[PDB]
Design a protein around this ligand. Sequence first.
Ligand SMILES: [Zn+2]
Lengths: 50, 100, 133, 397, 397
Amino acid sequence: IINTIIYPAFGMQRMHYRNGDPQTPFQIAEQQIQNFQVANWLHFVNNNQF
Amino acid sequence: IINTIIYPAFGMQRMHYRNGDPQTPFQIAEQQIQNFQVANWLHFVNNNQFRQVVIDGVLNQVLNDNIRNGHVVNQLMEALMQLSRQQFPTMPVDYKRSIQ
Amino acid sequence: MDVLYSLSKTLKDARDKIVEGTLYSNVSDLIQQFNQMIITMNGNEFQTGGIGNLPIRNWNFDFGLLGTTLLNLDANYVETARNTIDYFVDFVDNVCMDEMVRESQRNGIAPQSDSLRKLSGIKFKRINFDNSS
Amino acid sequence: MDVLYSLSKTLKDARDKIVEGTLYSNVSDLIQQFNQMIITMNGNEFQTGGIGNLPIRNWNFDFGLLGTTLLNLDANYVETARNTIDYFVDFVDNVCMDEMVRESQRNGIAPQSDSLRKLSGIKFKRINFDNSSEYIENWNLQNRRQRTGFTFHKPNIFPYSASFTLNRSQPAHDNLMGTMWLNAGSEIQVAGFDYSCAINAPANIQQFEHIVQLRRVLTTATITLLPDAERFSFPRVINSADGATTWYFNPVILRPNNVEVEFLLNGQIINTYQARFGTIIARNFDTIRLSFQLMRPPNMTPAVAALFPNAQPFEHHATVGLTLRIESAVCESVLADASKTMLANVTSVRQEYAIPVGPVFPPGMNWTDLITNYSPSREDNLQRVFTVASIRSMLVK
Amino acid sequence: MDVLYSLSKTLKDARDKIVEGTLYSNVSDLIQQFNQMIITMNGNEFQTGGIGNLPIRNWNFDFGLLGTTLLNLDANYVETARNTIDYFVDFVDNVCMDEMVRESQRNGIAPQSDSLRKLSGIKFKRINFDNSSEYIENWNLQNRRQRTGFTFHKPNIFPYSASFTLNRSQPAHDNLMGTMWLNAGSEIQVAGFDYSCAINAPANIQQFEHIVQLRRVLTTATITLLPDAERFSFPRVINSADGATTWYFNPVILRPNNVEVEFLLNGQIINTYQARFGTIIARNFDTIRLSFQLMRPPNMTPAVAALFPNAQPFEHHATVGLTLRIESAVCESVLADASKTMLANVTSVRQEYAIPVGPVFPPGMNWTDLITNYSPSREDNLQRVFTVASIRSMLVK
Ligand SMILES: [Zn+2]
């Protein structure tokens, strides 16, 4: 999602997102780009649990 | 073992490692480890020298072995307990999963 | 005892770092610590006071945890939190004061109050943190 | 306002935790907060100054973010950062100072300057963080209307007052009886004198009393009380009450008899100490009452007897006294004390920029005048102004 | 240097946040920083001591890193850690002390010891972290050539000086006029005396003046100014200026007339106060000038008139005085004050280890001698040495 849907048509692709296994990939997109609507999704999804 | 195990799955030296030919990778690793359990294995393994010293039933030098090992066994119990706390991060998932 | 300490730095670093407008991530490490507490507590009941003019008030826990859904802090988030803090504040005050009056010749270096004696219990040690005071 | 606070702790915890070396992981939580700021700012425009000799300065924002990439920090990383910080520092300074000068009667609590008024705006609230700085800590608790409180060493609660009261006097001022004192800062010295050495007094004892009313309640006060008032133990030539002439005071000191100190709150005795010198605790009071007596010595060696004749002239004047010093205390209202630089910071910025006298504060932020008529407006303005001074001192000293 | 700092805040924030029980995710960011260190160190050898009675202890490194998962900490975890910390503590102590004694005329601002010189090395920089300790904070801001600043309650700016100046005297010392004073620490007391009570003086007024030149500028000073100099209000027998005889001082105190205090900076009046007693602010000054007068009382009751005859002998000596105390102030240079233990720490370590007198500091780190000739070299060495003392006090008190 992060590398083919949100960055790539949101003029946010400059690096095309490089990830090399372990840590959390949604997560890190959160503290990277700014936008509120987009920004709430991230925290609610990421830290969403049972 | 040292490389493709412990060190990284345990998160410690992510600098994987580099031996020459004198003192042993199983031992030195010790001085540099912080998980007692892990740490005892090391000295015991590096120091368990087949107690080359015996003179029984009249002249029978038959390089012997630890009561410990013998049937005190625990060594095993400890070899396990140390294993019981090697379950963690660093690289891809299918890794820890499979290994542990 | 050390237990006690935490309880506060928890609240301070709380009533301080938790305000209308700070990014969640500035409290991620904190939030956690907090919840951890609530858990260990809920269920057990306490008695403070019972000396001189000091009132005997009974405290009880059975609260709910703190929602970590949020990107910044919406006002609403705070108020629902502050309400929970205020019960702990008014608590600790009564806890401190109760152990701040008892004295003992033999062992006057350990906990005296029914309130604190119970804290030194092992099942609570799980809280201690940031001992910089 | 709280906004403002952050701006600093941001920079401090910044100009502090960001240096050639350390691991990213120690600042990860920080870096973020920072950027978040730049964003909210960029695009906006400001204006500070314009009053008195204060320069007018405009500021704009258009800055790059921070490399959340790297593992460790290389020198180059810092310098490109420090360059951005320095613009904010030089900024805040100008922001503080601009709001540290304006006063206001009606609402002397809320913001004044065009600079800050704009900050209280909602769109900036996205910046608050880590309010452990004692002052802001109390700024909040007061908004929510709750029990505040500060800490002071040698507080400055007593407006300067140095005078006397002659309870018995006559034109020649050769047989006086009364008290003289000095109330200033955190100290009180008071002496009771009786030129006649209680020769005709009932039980040969003259009673004295000194009452001091604080303008604000002090709690948790650690106090030193000592017998004798050294300040009034030496020969003096003093102006008469009407200023028409001068009298002579030639003291000889005796121990104060039946010393009783009362710390009252709304007329009620909260703490009372009878002849206890050394360190005493006064836990909550708005008034101090010192009562002490001069008792004519019932037995006197010749040398002593010679000082106290049965008839005038009375040449050696029997004097008893007390000294009381408030070492530390807590007050719900801001006050000047012997350690904090707040009053000095506010007073200094106003003096340096030739700020005109306003409608709230006395000329020169004079402490005695301020504490003497410590109105609600002066206190709200003082607290606002002291809190800003404390925010400023986190970065600029 | 900055390196050094870290080493501690590392240990403190360590011996503090690492206790039986706490949740790991409170130290995750910390743990890391720690390990990072061990690494950089291991494989290095050090040596401290070698001077005076300072032992020469040697050190080597070979540890590793903590890192095994655990939601919470088990007792066992701590003890295996504390054992490693204790070697670093006992280390740093020896490191501090070793660099806290050496002085260098040349670069008394640079590292000295074989121990530290090695630390400033680049390969160690990978350890820096959290510089919020007031002293280091200022160490940096200076190294970058910027505006420093510190905080002091009752600063120690005045070298001890207790003397007098006779403006009118004669062999018998029976009709003197002049001033006597005590400048020490943060306080000044000065008295002006005129045995003749200005009987033949123009307007029956004798002018006095006392000037004190600070060795460093003080800003933001909160000051208490009170009339009278109690220290010079009692009878004294004093040595004559030439030491050949002794004179008698028998004071009687009058209120100082036309009191004017000026706080000057480079000859310019920055603050001036006319007869204002109590709390006053002096925002930036390198000199204090106190001017006051003795005015013969125009109207005197008999008792007063009797003290001041038209002709000698003059037996009661008219005296006026002032007392000034700097409660708090900011200085761009380090100074001793009434609260900080820096001077005492440095002086104490040197005394305990019988450190020989060096080329920079006066014998015994004598404060009066130091502040009297506060050269750039002494200040740079003092700052280095004070900053190290402050780093040490984070762990060892
Ligand atoms: Zn003091």
